[PDB]
């Protein structure tokens, strides 16, 4: 096939221009993102029943919805949480590859069918079904420095003048609000209700039948009467649109024309729909707007457009209102991708330099300089064929594949040069002879590398996509590389190559051949040495930490504050304020801003939690290892242990926000007999105590829930209520409206529909004794206090009740101890769970579910890959024994990478594994080429298995050294990288360099030995 | 025809007529499912001992077995050969007439005294300045 | 095939004269003879 | 029903229109609300877009706006469906 | 183009003083002018 | 009585159902047992 | 109509490039598909 192109170079140039144009077109139509879709599709039903506890929402909302979630296709599992704030979160996780839209629509259809069974308040609030995806493209905070506007005003302004236009920006899949827009709070005063002989139910009824919209009709409407000449629609009632307009609502007139209005017994104002969460930014009040990227969209773009829109909005803002960005990841991904492109360009330049250093012919060095970029461009086209994007994983896979691209070009060009330098042939004949020499070797190498890399794309689970990205971006690169070795390089070597330090290299080569001959004189020692190397490689591989992905200092981190049970919103403050003060006083030069959010947390949503999104300055302003995120979080968590009130921990965001800590499991106890909640807590405590007796394997085994807290139970005497003439419904409505609020109806503020909330004033619903201030009107206009027909006490109840697959459950988290694989800890956990009281089951969720379901498919995939590689090698050569001489070079390339990983303290993560595979592939390529040359010399020339091998290794030494020096020097910046995004590139570079050094320093002394010892064995 | 799209379209059309149905029909539950006509399989549950009658076995199957099997991928429909437990109030017309009561009164009393009531929280947001307590309030619970 | 059934005519005017209203008549005739799902309850932690 | 164009534009049109933001392959979107109370928020997509997938995308995006809509439309029901813009044929029926 | 419209406004205090509730006035106006849809019936076996 | 969804495979659905039954079996109250009076997929398996 | 008017020149350019490249590949020269690219205006002015 290359011989078809040597005499036909214009065709090769044309079909290379096609590849270049396709790559250029695809670069612009490839999306851009920090990461692909890793987590399996999940749909999160969210419901809100205001004022309820965990038990009420579980019994009336969670169970009803869960019992109607049947008939949905490809459902891995579901887990529901019911909080004491009245919120229900049911997350259904589906199979990987399941269409997210279809799953969401099926879930929402089942929810719509189950809606009539839900309480009226839940239906009024609404139940939202939405897909869960990447955390946030960008968090657009809005602050008011002047302090004139409170947080509610800022949130209302954001909801009015920002969400509508930001959503119109291209690439913005959805937007979220960090606050509650305006909503009219009628603040009931029990003293005036008792005075004016009123009750909250009367207020609710008056507001309902004082603000509604009514259909009216038309003048001259059809059917018309004969002679009609006008037709105008009539208007009857409009919703109130002013505070004093609600103030004038008539509640009662008494008997002497009292004319008591709404404002007499209550305060009418504009406030927030929800007061649970208050957000601040460096102390001053603030708001936010969470932004999510669309499914297909640029990350560098569609984030700069948002900044442009905010800049456009800036002049049209109230005085003192400005925009800040406490969280953004566009600069980080931009810098990482720029570093990757710079690394590729540097690799091309150093290949040019080394190839001129070895081959003094300048015109020969331009052949890869043209060939190498083209393949890269083609790779992008292949991505456009498979619908991939410009991910971090894809660019790092291309970085790893550049080493195979460069040596694939160098080998053929060096062979052409060596042919015309040794035989003095014209460039065309020399190129033809060289392409004849390595005609089938390139195809065999391509098949071997495909068999090595394709099976890694078939791993199942969340980790399957991560491996698939690299597998595709490397297999496509190799498939295009073999073509560009058979197409552009021969034509360039023919039409762009003239006909017709060295001394030290010649002296070393002659000395090298003597060393190889001396080694071949006695091959016994070099086989036991190889066995020792293999044993050491196995020992290092078995004893090595494992990880998912290297956590990187993305420029931000988080601080979590967890006040004890029963803490208030103001107790989280002056503790969340101390964190801000510490960050903006003791770390002024490293921390640019902090975004404190109160009452949000991570385990629950109560008032005793909070989180601060600490955003550091630019990496240019953070010199040294002490100003990095890792070295700052430890100092923060050391300085936060002095707080003896809350429990404050500072940590860094994971590389992937979805799944992390691959060494940890996600065990979950299930109650499969209706034992209850106390018995399930006892079983969980027993399991925790039993697991605390095995510190050698299980470490930090903790529950993922909230322990029981005191609650105020009011029991109403039905007989007393009947005797006193007060209805149970009236009492319940009064209590719920006073102490929990009641979303009554809607109104129109400024052309937007806001809610109208009715709730007691703050000072009258604080202490239990305040219940004595509330009276219920009996049938005969008589007020009875709550102290007459009811009693109250304190009892322990759960603040957050969770269920798994429709059964009560308790989530237990933990990690395997160092030196112990996670699968070795899951078996111990499920052995401990087998001695629990009867009726208590167990199950694995999340990452543990993926690990248990996938099983040990990696050894099977490796076995089938090895079988296919052996078959391809036995095809390329003819004898069944020759392929062993190639398959015995893998440990030589693995041992160096293992040494580098151990010395640098790295971890056996995805990047290290892919780099190990790359080194294995390149070493196998070198062995394939050497043994092919040796076999060809033995066959076509009839040499005696010793001079043939020596000649083959002598003529193969130069390309191997050239490619090793070009590729080691091309990844040195990755190894010595210490800037932004220098944990992923360091991890992917150190292992590759370590493997590649020892895959060529000593493999050149072993492949001839392997070939010789195999040949004189069968 | 694609089954998923057909089900989505027919359910979208059904949602229009859903509000027009009687409240009893809506609260019983209208179900739209894509499934075959013949039974793929039948899983019977029996008791070797005589300690549980037909109702007991049917209730156990409905409560602890039907829910999870109905969610198994590829299962389009599950028909229970029985019915789970429900609080059956067998009225007595003679006794109802003796005390001058009607079934409407019984229904009203059951609705009033078997409700799960949400009663807010102690120290709920927005709190008054200087608050040290925040606990939920338990008004009423469903009978068990 | 066609089957016998019990057609019971409620007289609206006679019901109004007697003082009863035809909402409790229908509610009684339905709840007594055909059952009436009232609300839910919690049996062994499950909604029934 | 009952509300004029101005009233129904802010309570229905202005509530549903902005939610239709992250929908794949959408060229444009035009809504109209008249004094009868009816509204029609059409969504013209890019040519070649799979129609029945865009329909479910619009449906699941609309269901995020139902809580914000007034109760009176809920009993009427919002109908989302693929629509043309011209009559294929008209079948008149007369009485000779 | 823009059309003239008829606006009817009700005095809530006056209506309550005179003994008529808003819940009656609204539905009376709607039924009289808008045309109220009460319920269904059977015409030749079809629900109308 | 379990009926498979349209377009689903019978054999893998039956296998999943049997796996779910095996998972449920340890928590059965003493006395209960599971029988299969209308299993049809064994015929398909035997024919293949 | 506006979209088609906007995208017509790019269509012409890409068609010309494809024809030029395929002719160069087939006829193994760059001057051969350059004496053909000059007769295109002669055939286009006729259509115009
Ligand atoms: C980019 C892909 C374009 C490749 C087109 C190459 C066409 C070509 O060289 O023709 C023959 C391909 O031979 C083959 O069968 C190789 C497969 C490549 C097509 C050469 O083969 P040939 O006609 O010189 O001789 C064959 C027996 N003698
Ligand atoms: C030969 C060179 C190119 C082969 C194309 C293979 C691409 C591929 O995997 O095709 C998939 C079918 O195979 C599959 O479903 C994958 C299973 C096949 C087993 C593995 C065989 C590897 C194929 C050989 C390629 C290696 C290169 C050889 C030089 C379809 O998926 P799509 O993404 O193309 O279509 C988008 C829809 N999903
Ligand atoms: C795609 C098919 C691969 C065949 C390569 C073409 C071929 O005949 O090359 C020969 C050696 O290649 C080979 O024998 C290399 C193929 C190695 C694996 C092929 C197994 C595919 C199933 C002759 O090349 P030569 O002139 O050196 O003799
Ligand atoms: C780019 C656009 C494609 C244009 C087609 C050009 C075909 C190659 C020109 C030379 C040719 O005719 O090839 C003959 C062999 O055919 C072949 O083997 C044809 C090779 C072409 C195969 C693939 C073409 C599509 C490339 C896709 C673009 C990416 C060798 O003719 P001769 O000179 O030996 O004899 C001539 C009289 N007997």
Strands A75-83 and A87-94: antiparallel
Q: State how far the Cα of A239 lies from the Cα of C18, in Å rounded to an integer.
A: 44
Phi-psi region of B123 (alpha: psi -120 to 50; beta: other; left: phi over 0): left
How far is residue A413's CA from residue A358's CA, in Å, rounded to a whole number? 12
Q: How far apart are CA F13 and CA B36, in angstroms?
A: 14
Q: For residues A210 and A239, is the Cβ–Cβ distance under 8 A?
A: no
| Conformational region of residue A424, where left means phi above 0, alpha means psi within -120 to 50, and beta covers everything else | left
Q: CB contact, 8 Å: A49 with chain B?
A: yes
What whole-number distance in Å separates Cα of residue F5 and Cα of residue F17?
13
CA distance D32 to G30: 59
Peptide bond into B126 cis (omega under 30): yes
How far is Cα A809 from Cα A822, in angstroms, rounded to an integer?
22
CA-nearest residue, atom 12 of ligand 3: A440
Best substitution site from A401, A453, A454 to test ligand 2's pocket, by max atoms within 8 Å of Cβ? A454
What's the token pair of residue A423? 């035989």
CA atoms within 13 A on the CB side of A55: 25
Give a three-class secondary structure readout of A141-201: EEEECCCCCCHHHHHHHHHHHCHHHHCCCCCEEEEEECCCCEEEEEEECHHHHHHCCCCHH
Q: Long-range pairs for A576-583 at CB < 8 Å and ≥24 separation?
A: A576/A610, A576/A612, A577/A283, A578/A643, A579/A612, A579/A640, A579/A648, A580/A280, A580/A282, A580/A283, A580/A612, A582/A636, A582/A639, A582/A640, A583/A559, A583/A612, A583/A614, A583/A636
Identify which of A135, A138, A156, A154 has the alpha carbon closest to the alpha carbon of residue A146.
Answer: A154
- Verify D-F touch: 3 or more CB pairs within 8 A: no
**Measuring CA to CA, which residue among A323, A379, A348 is closest to residue A138?**
A323
Torsion sign over Cα A659, A660, A664, A669: negative
- Here the tokens at position A72 are 């949905």
Residue G18 near ligand 4, beta carbon < 6 Å:
no
Cα gap A462→A35, rounded to integer Å: 13
Question: A168 — contact with chain D (CB < 8 Å)?
Answer: yes
Q: Are A755 and A183 in contact (CB under 8 A)?
A: yes
In D, minimum Cα distance to E5 occurs at D4
Question: Would the CB atoms of B8 and D59 count as touching at under 8 Å?
Answer: yes
Class for domain A709-797, per CATH? Answer: alpha beta
Helix (H, G, I), strand (E, B) or coil at A523: coil
On the CB side of A685, CA atoms within 13 Å amount to 9
Q: How far apart are CA A504 and CA A509, in angstroms?
A: 9
CB contact under 8 A, F27 and A71: no
d(CA A335, CA A332): 5
Q: What is the dihedral of CA A759, A762, A767, A768, to 10 degrees?
A: -10
Distance CA A43, CA A376 (A): 38
DSSP, collapsed to helix, strand or coil, labels residue B48 as: coil
Give the number of A-C residue pairs with CB atoms closer than 8 Å.
15
β-strands A753-760, A182-188: how paired? parallel
How big is chain G, counted in residues? Answer: 48
Question: Cα separation of A885 and A867, whole Å?
Answer: 15
Whole-angstrom distance, CA of residue A48 vs CA of residue A745 = 16
Residue A828: Cβ-neighbour burial (10 angstroms; 0-12, 13-18, 19+): middle
DSSP E strands: which ranges in A273-344? 278-281, 284-287, 289-293, 321-328
Is there a contact between F27 and A672 if contact means CB atoms under 8 Å apart?
Answer: yes
User: For residue A637, how many other CB atoms are within 10 A of its CB?
Assistant: 14
Q: Name the nearest CA neighbour of A359 among A411, A308, A403, A324.
A: A411
b/e B60-92 (16+ beta carbons within 10 angstroms → b): bbbbbbbbbbbbbbbbbbbeeeeebbeeeeeee
DSSP 3-state of A280: strand
Q: Please, which residues bridge with residue C43 across strands? A: C46
Say how far apart CA A21 and CA A373 lie, in whole Å: 12
Angle (CA) A149 A151 A154, round 5°: 65
Query: Please, are residues A615 and A592 in contact by the beta-carbon 8 Å criterion?
Result: yes
- Contact A996/A922 with Cβ under 8 angstroms? yes
CA A108 to centroid of ligand 3, rounded, Å: 55
Q: Could you tell me the fold of the domain covering A556-652?
A: Alpha-Beta Plaits (3.30.70)
CA–CA distance, A460 with F28 (Å, rounded to integer): 33
Contacts of G29 in chain A (CB under 8 A): 10
Element (H, E) at A402: helix A392-423
Residue A438 token pair: 């390595």
Look up residue A133 and give its two tokens: 């995806």
Token digits of residue D3: 């509300």
Whole-angstrom CA distances from A626 to A362, A560, A629, A987, G16 are 47, 22, 8, 20, 60
Q: Does E7 touch chain A (CB under 8 A)?
A: yes
| Locus of tokens 């549950």 | B45
Q: Where are the alpha helices (DSSP H) in chain C?
A: 12-18, 24-34
Sign of CA dihedral A751, A755, A761, A767: negative
Whether A357 and A454 have beta carbons less than 8 Å apart is answered as no
| Nearest CA distance, D94 vs chain B (angstrom) | 31
DSSP string, A48-75: E-TT--HHHHIIIIIHHHHTT--S-SSE
Number of the ligand closest to the Cα of A483: 1
Q: Ligand 1 atom 21: the closest Cα is on which residue?
A: A1
List phi, psi (to 5°) of A3. Answer: -65, -25
- E15 near E22, Cβ under 8 Å? yes
Give the SS3 label for residue F30.
Answer: coil
Alpha-helix runs per DSSP H in A487-557: 488-495, 502-521, 525-542
- Output the residue whose Cα is nearest ligand 3's atom 13: A876
Question: How far apart (Å, rounded) are the C-alpha atoms in residues B68 and A439?
Answer: 60
Q: How far is E47 from chain A (nearest CA, A)?
A: 23
d(CA A564, CA A561): 10
Taking every pair of Cα atoms in chain E, the longest distance, rounded to a whole number of angstroms, is 49
Number of helices (H) and strands (E) in chain F: give both, helices first. Answer: 2, 2
List of residues 6+ apart from B69 with CB closer than 8 A:
B43, B75, B78, F2, F17, F20, F21
Q: Which residues contact C36 (CB under 8 A, 6 or more apart)?
A: B103, B107, C27, C30
Check residue A555 and report its DSSP letter.
S
d(CA A650, CA A561): 9
Neighbours of A423 (CB within 10 A): 10
CA distance A442 to A374: 18
Cβ atoms of A885 and A1014 within 8 Å: the answer is yes
| Distance, CA of F44 to CA of F13 (rounded, Å) | 14
User: Do A736 and B64 lie within an 8 Å CB cutoff?
Assistant: no
- A1003 within 8 A of A890, measured Cβ to Cβ: no
| Residue in A972, A897, A967 with CA at minimum distance from that of residue A926 | A967
Nearest-10 Cα torsion for A120, A121, A123, A125: 160
**Cα A678–Cα A682–Cα A683 angle in degrees, nearest 5:** 120
**Residue whose C-alpha is closest to residue A803's, from A26, A62, A15:** A62
Residue A927 to residue A934: CA distance in whole angstroms: 11
DSSP secondary structure code for residue A908 in this structure: B
| Angle between the N-to-C axes of helices A910-941 and A947-975, in degrees from 0 to 180, rounded to the nearest 10 | 160
Alpha-carbon dihedral angle through residues E31, E35, E39, E44, given to the nearest 10 degrees: 140
Helix residue ranges, H only, A628-717: 629-639, 678-691
Could you tell me the CA-to-CA distances from A935 to A79, A945, A1008 in Å, in that order? 62, 9, 11
A762 CB neighbours in chain B (<8 A) are 126-128
SS3 of chain D: CCCCHHHHHHHHHHHHCCCCCCCCCEEEEEEEECCCCCEEEEEEECCCCCHHHHHHHHHHHHCCCCCCCCHHHHHHCCCCCCCCCCCCCCCCCCCC
Token pair for residue A982?
């220098």
Cα A394 from Cα A385, distance rounded (Å)? 14
**D-chain residues near A124 (CB < 8 A):** 67, 71
Same fold, A184-272 and A709-797: yes
Question: Which fold is adopted by the domain A184-272?
Answer: 3.30.2090
CA distance A674 to A101: 35
Q: Which residues contact G38 (CB under 8 A, 6 or more apart)?
A: none
Q: Are the beta carbons of B57 and B46 closer than 8 angstroms?
A: yes
The closest of G13, A31, A764, C47 to B29, measured between CA atoms, is: C47
Which H helix or E strand runs over A985? helix A984-1001
The residues, any chain, with a CB within 8 Å of residue A420's CB and separated by 6 or more, are A426, A427, A430, A499, A500
Which phi and psi (to 5°) does residue C18 adopt? -70, -15
Chain centre distance of CA A806 = 27
Cβ count within 10 A of residue B112: 15
What tokens were used for A646?
Answer: 């809350």
In whole angstroms, how far apart are CA B23 and each of A122, A676, B27, C28? 17, 33, 6, 17
Which residues have CB under 8 Å from C43's CB, separation 6+? B85, B87, B144
CA distance A810 to A794: 24
Cβ–Cβ gap B142/C40 under 8 Å: yes
Q: What Cα–Cα distance (Å) separates residue A511 from each residue in A488, A520, A1009, D63?
A: 36, 14, 17, 78
CB A992 within 8 A of CB A906: no
Cα A618 to Cα G26: distance, rounded to the nearest angstrom: 55
List all residues 6 or more positions away from A410 whose beta carbon is below 8 Å from its beta carbon: A351, A355, A368, A959, A962, A963, A966
Q: What's the residue count for chain D?
A: 96
Determine if ligand 4 sits within 6 Å of the CB of residue A458: no
CATH topology for B87-144? Answer: 3.30.2090
Residue B16, chain A, CB below 8 Å: the answer is no
Smallest CA–CA distance from B75 into chain A, residue: A71
Interior CA angle at D37 toward D33 and D42, to 5°? 35
Query: Is A672 an 8 Å CB contact of chain F?
Result: yes
Name the CA radius of gyration of chain A, rounded.
36
């Amino acid at each position: 096939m290359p011989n078809f192109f040597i005499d036909r170079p214009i065709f090769a140039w044309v079909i290379a221009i096609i590849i270049m144009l396709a790559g250029g077109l695809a670069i612009l139509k490839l999306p851009v993102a920090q990461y692909p879709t890793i987590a399996p599709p999940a749909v999160t039903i969210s419901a809100s029943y205001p004022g309820a506890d965990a038990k009420t929402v579980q019994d009336t909302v969670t169970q009803v919805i869960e019992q109607n979630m049947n008939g949905i296709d490809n459902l891995m599992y579901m887990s529901s949480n019911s909080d004491s704030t009245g919120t229900v979160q049911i997350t259904l996780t589906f199979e990987s590859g399941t269409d997210a839209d279809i799953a969401q629509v099926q879930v929402q259809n089942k929810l719509q069918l189950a809606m009539p069974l839900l309480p009226q308040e839940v239906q009024q609030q609404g139940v939202s079904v939405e897909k869960s995806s990447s955390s946030f493209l960008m968090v657009v905070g809005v602050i008011n420095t002047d302090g004139t506007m409170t947080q509610e005003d800022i949130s209302d302004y954001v909801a009015a003048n920002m969400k509508d236009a930001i959503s119109r920006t291209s690439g913005v899949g959805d937007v979220q609000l960090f606050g509650s827009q305006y909503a009219m709070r009628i603040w009931m005063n029990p003293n005036e209700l008792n005075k004016f002989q009123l009750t909250p139910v009367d207020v609710i009824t008056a507001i309902k039948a004082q603000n509604a919209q009514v259909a009216a009709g038309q003048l001259g409407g059809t059917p018309p009467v004969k002679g009609q000449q006008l037709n105008a629609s009539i208007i009857a009632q409009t919703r109130l649109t002013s505070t004093e307009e609600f103030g004038k609502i008539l509640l009662k007139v008494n008997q002497d024309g009292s004319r008591v209005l709404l404002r007499d017994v209550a305060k009418i104002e504009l406030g927030g729909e929800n007061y649970d969460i208050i957000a601040e930014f460096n102390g001053q009040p603030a708001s936010g707007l969470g932004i999510k990227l669309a499914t297909g969209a640029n990350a560098l773009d569609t984030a700069a457009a948002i900044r442009a829109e905010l800049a456009k909005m800036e002049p049209f803002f109230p005085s003192g209102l400005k925009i800040v960005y406490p969280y953004d990841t566009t600069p980080f991904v931009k810098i990482s991708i720029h570093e990757v492109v710079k690394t590729l360009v540097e690799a091309i330049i150093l290949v040019f330099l080394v190839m001129y250093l070895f081959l003094q012919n300048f015109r020969a060095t331009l052949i890869p300089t043209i060939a190498v970029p083209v393949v890269l461009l083609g790779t992008f086209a292949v991505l456009a064929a498979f619908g991939f994007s410009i991910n971090t994983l894809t660019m790092f896979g291309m970085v790893l594949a550049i080493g195979l691209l460069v040596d694939d070009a160098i080998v053929v060009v060096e062979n052409v040069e060596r042919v015309m330098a040794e035989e003095g042939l014209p460039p065309k004949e020399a190129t033809r002879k060289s392409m004849g020499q390595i005609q089938g070797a390139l195809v065999g190498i391509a098949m071997v590398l495909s068999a090595v890399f394709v099976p890694m794309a078939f791993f199942g689970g969340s980790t399957g996509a991560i491996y698939r990205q690299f597998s595709i971006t490397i297999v496509s690169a190799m498939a295009l590389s073999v073509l560009v070795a058979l197409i552009l390089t021969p034509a360039l070597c023919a039409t762009m190559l003239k006909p017709i330090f060295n001394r030290m290299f010649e002296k070393s080569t002659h000395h090298y051949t003597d060393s190889v001959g001396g080694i071949l004189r006695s091959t016994g020692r070099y086989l036991v040495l190889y066995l020792i190397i293999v044993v050491g490689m196995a020992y290092l591989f078995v004893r090595l930490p494992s990880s998912f992905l290297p956590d990187e200092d993305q420029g931000v981190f988080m601080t979590m504050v967890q006040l004890p049970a029963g803490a208030t919103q103001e107790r989280t403050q002056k503790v969340l304020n101390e964190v801000t003060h510490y960050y903006l006083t003791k770390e002024k030069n490293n921390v640019e801003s902090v975004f404190a959010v109160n009452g949000f947390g991570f385990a629950g949503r109560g008032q005793n939690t909070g989180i601060a999104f600490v955003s550091l300055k630019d990496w240019a302003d953070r010199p040294g290892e002490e100003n990095k995120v890792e070295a700052i979080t430890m100092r923060a968590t050391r300085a936060f242990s002095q707080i003896k009130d809350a429990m404050v921990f500072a940590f860094n965001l994971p590389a992937i926000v979805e799944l992390g800590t691959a060494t940890g499991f996600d065990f979950e106890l299930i109650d499969q007999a209706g034992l209850g909640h106390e018995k399930l807590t006892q079983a969980r405590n027993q399991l925790l105590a039993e697991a605390a007796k095995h510190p050698d394997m299980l470490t930090s085994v903790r529950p993922n829930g909230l322990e029981d807290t005191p609650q105020f139970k009011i029991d109403i005497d039905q007989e007393k209520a009947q005797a006193l003439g007060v209805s149970i419904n009236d009492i319940n409505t009064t209590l719920g409206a006073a102490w929990g609020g009641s979303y009554v109806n809607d109104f129109i503020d400024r052309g937007r529909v806001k809610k109208v909330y009715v709730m007691s004033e703050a000072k009258y619903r604080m202490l239990p004794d305040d219940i004595g201030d509330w009276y219920v009107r009996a049938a005969d206009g008589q007020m009875v206090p709550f102290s007459a027909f009811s009693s109250s006490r304190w009892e322990y109840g759960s603040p957050r009740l969770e269920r798994y697959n429709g059964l009560p459950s308790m989530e237990i988290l933990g990690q395997a101890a160092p030196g112990k694989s996670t699968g070795e800890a899951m078996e111990l956990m499920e052995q401990l769970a087998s001695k629990l009281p009867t009726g208590v089951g167990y199950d694995w969720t999340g990452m543990s579910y993926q690990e248990r379901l996938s099983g040990n498919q990696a050894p099977s995939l490796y076995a089938i890959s090895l079988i296919v590689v052996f078959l391809c090698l036995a095809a390329l050569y003819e004898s069944w024994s020759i392929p062993f001489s190639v398959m015995l070079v893998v440990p030589l390339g693995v041992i160096g990478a293992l040494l580098a990983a151990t010395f640098r303290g790295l971890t056996n993560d995805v990047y290290f594994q892919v780099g190990l595979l790359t080194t294995i592939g390149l070493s196998a390529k070198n062995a394939i080429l050497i043994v092919e040359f040796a076999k060809d010399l033995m066959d076509k020339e009839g040499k005696g298995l010793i001079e043939a091998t020596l000649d083959a290794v002598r003529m193969r030494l130069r390309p191997i050294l050239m490619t090793s020096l070009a590729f080691i020097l091309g990844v040195m910046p990755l190894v010595i990288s210490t800037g932004a995004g220098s944990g992923a590139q360091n991890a992917v570079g150190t292992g590759v360099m370590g493997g590649m050094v020892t895959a060529t320093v000593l493999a050149i002394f072993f492949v001839p030995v392997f070939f010789v010892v195999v040949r004189r064995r069968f």
